């Protein structure tokens, strides 16, 4: 018997796809690796003052990189921990990242290892 | 600003039936109405039993 | 020529009804078993104003016949209705102002409003403020009823059609003079884009049959036939007569 005057489509089984061949032969290579994310540090006078005043490293990064990926790229690249990352898109269309290291790390020491100072 | 995480429970409740929804006077009116109307139904029910047996 | 004003209204656009602040359609409950056989009690919660509608509206709450929930309704308010009043709808509802009954249960000579034309259409006749219908007679053989409409016309409707007892509230509205263009502006601001009206004789020939001439004058009979095509049918359409209605004509 039916207690509802409105007919509702009954639930039917649905299977998950089990393709006989993969549409793509293999996964694509990672196009946003650590080297792709971190293009080069910024060596302007304004950028340099932030190395010691704020313990901050200024990087030019790929425009498609987010703060989460920048944080992981800096960890893999220079083996340093980050307190916070601030990003902006410059008028020339490139992305700049202000990376502040934790007190456990010294930006000036890391800057010398990079080779900008 | 009424969100539970932002306001203590005592500030968004009144300890009474329909507290925070009906005033005290309104609750009093409903309670009396519910009791009196229910009593009148009993009178109607009994009153028709005395007349039903009339035969 | 160009498309005259009367023709441009049908396309909609700037001539659509202004309904932004309207409270919704005012109508009876949907006909169901309870109203067909017995009666259902409702309570009036508030009497509200509907922009563009002279007659006030009444919000009524009903207990749903078979669902655990309230059933909200919006009725055209009858004269005498008040908040907290109990309203009874159904075949066996008593003959009192505000109740909704089928015409079959309403005796001859009664005053009714919001009368259905088709059983269950929820009311189409006598809905404006101060208007009502009068039950004339019943025809048990045909199962039909005769009622007198506000215009003075007699109509046959099936006896199952529902109607509210009494007349529509808000009567006497049109007796008060407006006195001002601004009052007319506010009246039609909430109805539709129909005011002010420019006289055809004040226009040019391109946009109205009455336009043009070195004097303002129609130049041909303003009475036009029924079959005139759109754009030509202006003035007194299919007029059986004209001039002041004297004697039996104004009956």
């Amino acid at each position: 018997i039916r207690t509802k005057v409105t007919f509702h489509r009954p639930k039917t089984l649905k299977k998950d796809r089990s393709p006989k061949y993969p549409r793509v032969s293999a996964p694509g290579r990672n196009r946003l690796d650590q080297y792709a994310i971190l293009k080069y540090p910024l060596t302007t006078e304004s950028a340099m003052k932030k190395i010691e005043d704020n313990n901050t490293l200024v990087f030019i990064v790929d425009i498609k990189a987010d703060k989460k990926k920048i944080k992981d790229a800096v960890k893999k690249m220079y083996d340093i921990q980050i307190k916070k990352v601030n990003t902006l898109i410059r008028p020339d269309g490139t992305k700049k990242a202000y990376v502040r290291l934790t007190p456990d790390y010294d930006a000036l020491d890391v800057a010398n290892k990079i080779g900008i100072i | 600003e009424y969100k539970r995480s932002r306001l203590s429970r005592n500030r968004r409740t009144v300890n009474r039936a329909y507290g925070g929804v009906l005033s005290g006077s309104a609750v009093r009116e409903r309670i009396i109405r519910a009791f009196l109307v229910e009593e009148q139904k009993i009178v109607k029910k009994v009153l028709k039993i005395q007349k039903a047996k009339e035969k | 020529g160009r498309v005259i004003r009367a023709q441009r209204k049908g396309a909609g656009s700037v001539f659509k009804s202004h309904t932004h602040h309207r409270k919704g359609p005012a109508r009876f409950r949907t006909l169901d078993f309870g109203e067909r056989n017995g009666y259902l009690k409702g309570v009036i919660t508030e009497v509200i104003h509907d922009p563009g509608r002279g007659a006030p509206l009444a919000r009524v709450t009903f207990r749903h016949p078979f669902r655990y929930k309230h059933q909200k309704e919006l009725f055209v308010a009858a004269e005498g209705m008040y908040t907290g009043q109990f309203v009874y709808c159904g075949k066996k509802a008593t003959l009192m102002v505000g109740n909704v009954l089928p015409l079959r249960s309403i005796p001859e000579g009664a005053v009714v409003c919001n009368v259905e034309h088709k059983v269950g259409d929820r009311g189409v006749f006598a809905r404006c403020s101060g208007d009502y219908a009068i039950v004339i007679s019943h025809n048990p053989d045909n199962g039909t009823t005769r009622v007198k409409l506000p215009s003075g016309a007699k109509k046959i409707v099936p006896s199952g059609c529902r109607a509210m007892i009494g007349q529509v509230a808000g009567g006497g509205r049109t007796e008060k003079p407006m006195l001002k263009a601004g009052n007319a502006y506010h009246k039609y601001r909430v109805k539709r884009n129909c005011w002010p009206k420019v006289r055809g004789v004040a226009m040019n020939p391109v946009e109205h049959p009455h336009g043009g001439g070195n004097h303002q004058h129609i130049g041909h009979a303003s009475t036009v036939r029924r079959d005139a095509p759109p754009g030509q049918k202006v003035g007194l359409i299919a007029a059986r007569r004209t001039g002041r209605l004297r004697g039996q004509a104004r009956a």
Binding site: R2, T3, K4, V5, F7 | - | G38, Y39, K41, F66
Partner: protein, 230 residues
């Protein structure tokens, strides 16, 4: 236990909410369901010409079971059975026979057998769609003096021949061991379809109104009948 009590509910208009009820007859069915139900009604409302009305007079249930039981004894071989004999012959051919007795199916093949007068019994399905495929078969069988019957279910006929459906079946010859009971079945079938063919050519079917219409019509004629005696 005195703590248990009866709590009756007073139903009716404006009373206690009624419990869950069967509203099946009021269900707003999908389009497909509605169309097939209206299709059934429309067929019986309209007058059915005799050539189509003869398919409603199907073989009786009691005789149908006997006829279908015999057909099961002459089923065509299955796909697995068919392959199993073709390997028994290949080996036989390598190592250096009787005509089968089975039911004939297929409208094209059956019509040929009827025209050649080699058919002894034709079984026709009553629910062939389009009906024009078999609406003429009874006339052909009558003209060829071959007994025929109309049975219910093209799916049932198809199951005999290992097919989803079959429009009609034919028996060119039965095995000699059971030619007596088969002969009796022919007499009953021939007396119900072939012998009644001429009288059924003027029997228009359909014209059946709905139950509400019939009740409303029967009430009107009672008034006329009740006024006849007075």
């Amino acid at each position: 236990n005195p703590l248990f009590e009866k709590r009756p509910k007073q139903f009716g208009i404006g009373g206690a909410l009624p419990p869950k009820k069967d509203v099946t007859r009021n269900v707003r069915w999908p389009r497909n369901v509605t169309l097939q139900r209206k299709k059934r009604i429309l067929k019986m409302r309209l007058k059915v010409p005799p050539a189509l009305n003869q398919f409603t007079k199907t073989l009786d249930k009691n005789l149908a079971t006997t006829l279908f039981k015999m057909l099961l004894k002459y089923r065509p071989e299955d796909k697995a059975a068919k392959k199993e004999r073709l390997v028994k012959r290949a080996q036989a051919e390598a190592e250096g026979t009787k005509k089968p007795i089975i039911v004939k199916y297929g409208l094209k093949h059956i019509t040929y057998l009827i025209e050649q007068n080699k058919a002894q019994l034709v079984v026709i399905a009553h629910d062939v769609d389009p009906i024009e495929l078999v609406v003429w078969l009874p006339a052909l069988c009558r003209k060829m003096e071959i007994p025929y019957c109309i049975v219910k279910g093209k799916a049932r006929l198809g199951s005999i021949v290992h097919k989803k459906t079959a429009s009609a079946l034919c028996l060119t010859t039965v095995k000699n061991e059971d030619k007596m009971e088969f002969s009796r079945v022919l007499e009953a079938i021939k007396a119900n379809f072939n012998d009644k063919y001429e009288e059924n050519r003027k029997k228009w079917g359909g014209g059946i109104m709905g139950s509400k219409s019939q009740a409303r019509t029967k009430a009107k004629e009672r008034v006329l009948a009740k006024e006849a005696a007075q």
